[PDB]
Amino acid sequence: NKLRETNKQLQEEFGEASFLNFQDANQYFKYSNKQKLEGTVDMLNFLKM
Amino acid sequence: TRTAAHTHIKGLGLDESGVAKRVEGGFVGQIEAREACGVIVDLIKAKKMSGRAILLAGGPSTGKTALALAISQELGPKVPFCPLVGSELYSVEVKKTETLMENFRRAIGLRIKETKEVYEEVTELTPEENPLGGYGKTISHVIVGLKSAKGTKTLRLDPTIYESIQREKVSIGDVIYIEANTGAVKRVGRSDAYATEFDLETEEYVPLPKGEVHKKKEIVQDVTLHDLDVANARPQGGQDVISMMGQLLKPKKTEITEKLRQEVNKVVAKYIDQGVAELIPGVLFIDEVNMLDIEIFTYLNKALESNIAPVVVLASNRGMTTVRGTEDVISPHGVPPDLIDRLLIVRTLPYDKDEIRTIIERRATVERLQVESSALDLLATMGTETSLRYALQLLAPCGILAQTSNRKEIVVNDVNEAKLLFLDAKRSTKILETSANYL
Amino acid sequence: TRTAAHTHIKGLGLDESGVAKRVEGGFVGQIEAREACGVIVDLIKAKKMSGRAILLAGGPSTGKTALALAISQELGPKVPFCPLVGSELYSVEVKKTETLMENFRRAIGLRIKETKEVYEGEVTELTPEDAENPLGGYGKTISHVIVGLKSAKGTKTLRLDPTIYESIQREKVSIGDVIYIEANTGAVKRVRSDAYATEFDLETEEYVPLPKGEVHKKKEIVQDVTLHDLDVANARPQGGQDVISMMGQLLKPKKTEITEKLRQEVNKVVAKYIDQGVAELIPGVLFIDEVNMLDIEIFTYLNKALESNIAPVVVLASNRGMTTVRGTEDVISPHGVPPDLIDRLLIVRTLPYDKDEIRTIIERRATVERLQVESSALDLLATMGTETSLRYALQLLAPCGILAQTSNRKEIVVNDVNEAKLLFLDAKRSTKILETSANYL
């Protein structure tokens, strides 16, 4: 559930990376959050399997 | 491009609403048997109810084996199909009943699904220390990198995987794919990136893989429980004691116990309940069942009331014979009456002159040969006079004789000479009874 | 708390001077058979001469197996008894003769008794006593090693030969917590005291208590084994990582043809030990039930084997008449045993029971399994026990008890046994139904 919340965090972060060059252009910390969120949720899906 | 009395039978040739025409699927005549067997195909395809048996009876050269092959073709290449003969049940390694049980388990298959995430040149590798204990030395972490094609990516892991890849004997600059499920990694080879590193080499060039750093693929596997329980019973491994011993043990199959059967049944039951596995019942074929024995027949009854019994089909041509093993039991087709009570009987009938002539036409057509009308008409004459199979086999020598005198078609005198050259059973036994020189 | 057609036989019930009463040891009837069996029991108890054999003949359900079990009970738990059936002789691994010979030796056992002298306790201080070197030298030369002793009900202090310096090189217990030494042979044995269990919150070794009793113990050890175990162990390998042991660990050690030279060697060693006065050989008794299933080869090998020095006394059972011994067809012989073998052993005769004997047997069967039966029901049970068979009547008790339990009555009534007989059919009625019908039954 926490990692699904990180999926939602990615969505609010930038449109599933849609608004990267227009919204997240001047902020790189949120970029490094977005790289972690989806990767870790997929890894936790693997952990649930 | 070769055939052996078959492979011209393409299915059963049964239309919708269960009807069979005259010429279809390389099949002619015997409509009712085809209807019944198509109904059997429908019952198997239902995959609801299992444990039945069906025996079909008839004379020689009737098409029983053709009927079974038509069944197998109609079912398709997904459901397992295990043809067999009575003699192969006997063995010098295990019991007859046991071998029947391996075949029984081999008949039914199971399709399983599973997804796998795999990571796939190698940028670098580096371990990370004080063990804070009595251990000699270790690395806190290991950081590596993979190049691939769709961008590169670094990777942090445990010195166990570092040890495993070291055992794989892989160069620092190389292509590597690593399994995320357990960590097993094998040397893919020398990647194409470091081509012509020296003038002469031997390692494979291994073009760099085109894909993401990590790739997920869907795998669907179709196996039978017979593979499952032998895999469970047989040991595996590397240098461990039982591993070398089994490597030198000559692994003869010996008397699989029922405990494995119960365990695998429980595991597959919970897996299909989970919904990851689907069980596909198969059909097992025993040709020429008259060669079996009383013990096999009784254990066949017992296995026929079993839980996971696949549908089996039996073939025979015997009549009011005595079943092997005993002498006081005269039963039809050499099958004990108690077994006969436990299955159905499908009748088959001999063909006529017209049907034999049509068979000859079909068989000539499939082998890309030309037959003169009169020659084919006479071929039907001793097809009925002697046998269908004699005239069926006669065709190829006639074609050779036609090749001798440079003529594609087949003429009357060619087949007459062929008949003169090669004798039939009746003429041969006539010569045998006439002579007295041990012939 | 369960029985199976037996275990109600308490010995043979033979009084002094060889006399058998009526009701004793769960045995009634067939007095002379019991007298002969007691005679054989005394002969075996003599432990003087071996190789003798005896066979007993009679009708089915005549108590032959009961007589053999009574003999085994009378002998006691020291002399070995080896039950066997004729069919068990066959095997698909070795020859039948090999199995027969190994069973022959399995019949005879051996008892070894010996005593060891041991000093044990708690050592207050483990320190050798230094002394001047008798030879011109230097350093420390030990003349004695003082060992403290402490045991419950007895405690002393003693000294030993300094040769134990190598024995004290590796004990890994504590500073003289619990010890085990020998007088003549010396040595040591790791045995910590319970007084230090709570000093450490964790511990992976269970603390041992101090010895109870005299600080020095002269305890005797008695072991009873058969020569079959002896030469099986002699032939079978041992050890750990060596090539032969590791190969045998995966060899599936099927028994195969123990050679006669091992038999000679074990004979020699046991003979020298009994001559030494440390071993006592106890001849056993071996039972082959239902001997009519044997074959000519086994019979001839038996003729050869019973002439051997160490052939145990065997007992044979059969219930055949003018039958043809297996393997051949022309040999007509009583009980299906070749006449030459008959010539080499004695025969004990058993006789069928009567109505009163069957009734008493049924009474004993009711009493043993804690059941109550009415006198009329018991008499009726005796009636079709005589009419059909004793074993049917004996078996019918439990269903009658079940039917009585259904209606909540401890005792048993006549209509109960009538219903039970209606439900369960005997042999004659069953074959009557079989011959009447024609639907394959």
Place this chain on the structure above:
Amino acid sequence: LKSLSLIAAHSHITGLGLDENLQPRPTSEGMVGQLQARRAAGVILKMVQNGTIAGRAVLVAGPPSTGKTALAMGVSQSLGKDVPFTAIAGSEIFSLELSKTEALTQAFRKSIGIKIKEETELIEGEVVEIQIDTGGHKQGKLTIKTTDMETIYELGNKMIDGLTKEKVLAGDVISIDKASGKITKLGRSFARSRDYDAMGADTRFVQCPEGELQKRKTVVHTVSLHEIDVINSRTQGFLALFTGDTGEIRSEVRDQINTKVAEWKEEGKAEIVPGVLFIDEVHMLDIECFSFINRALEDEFAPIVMMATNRGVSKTRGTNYKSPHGLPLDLLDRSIIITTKSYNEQEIKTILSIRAQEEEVELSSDALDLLTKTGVETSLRYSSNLISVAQQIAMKRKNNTVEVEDVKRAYLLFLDSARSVKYVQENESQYIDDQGNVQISIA
């Protein structure tokens, strides 16, 4: 819940339709008719769960298709779990790697079950932190933790060595035997759950245990006698229960383990349970096996043995005389016979209806009556097989119900055994005789 079954030849049989005083109900759980046989089976069952007398031989007779195996299935379902029930046919006793007597002995030891109780004390998932040290024999005292409980424990040199093998960070939770055993890794905590970009098959993230780590829990253990003998047959023989190479275990483990189980019973920590060994198809067997059974019935650990057969007076396998019932008279003397009569028309109707509803087949009344008439003419199994094919052909005609004409088409499609015999009689020349004679030339 664990029914991987598609169907069974008799899956409607779930126990016996009895009551408090063991009265057979007219119809209950896929069972109809033969009330006397059912009452006898219930008596035998109550005897079995009584578990106070062993070595009883019960024989079931009857014609073919009379349902003798139905009673065995019913009683097996009735006893259910906690009691072994070995269903063995007469043909698997013939092994060329094992003596028939040895196979019978293995079967007999299989049918007896023994349960034991054992209690273990262990601290689970509490090793928190390692404080290595002065130097040598370090980490002599480290704390333990759970989600709800913590304690400091001192460690000795032996425990130091034990921890040295497979050393762990101790920030996880690890279970170690407080009963002077060894250590067992449990996994990793959540703190390092996000520390690897790839996974293996050695350590998996484990939860911090709830409650006190220390726990002295007792475990019951159930196993049959055959397994307990084969486990002591060699140094290690757990594969023998799987591979099947028992190897004809010699008669030294058997008596010693009988003494061991007697000792365990006297200690009260082990309880035996006498199961039921059922042998179908007994009429084929060797006389040596019959004599071995005759003796083995007398053993103290002799399970209840039930036999099934259908042949009448016939030759026995191993002799030259036509003994009645297919068995020697000695075996018949020490057994109990439960005969079963034939089946009736109303019973046929009920059985066919039960079979039809078992495979969720809608059946017209007239079709059911035609099936009953045929099952009166021929065997009942004939109609019990034709029901499915009639349903299939009705489906092919796109009508959900099984109309009469569909049943008639199914009957005309498949030959009766008697009809096949008659047709063979009409066409003897066409088929191949027992003398190797056959005719293929039509003209």
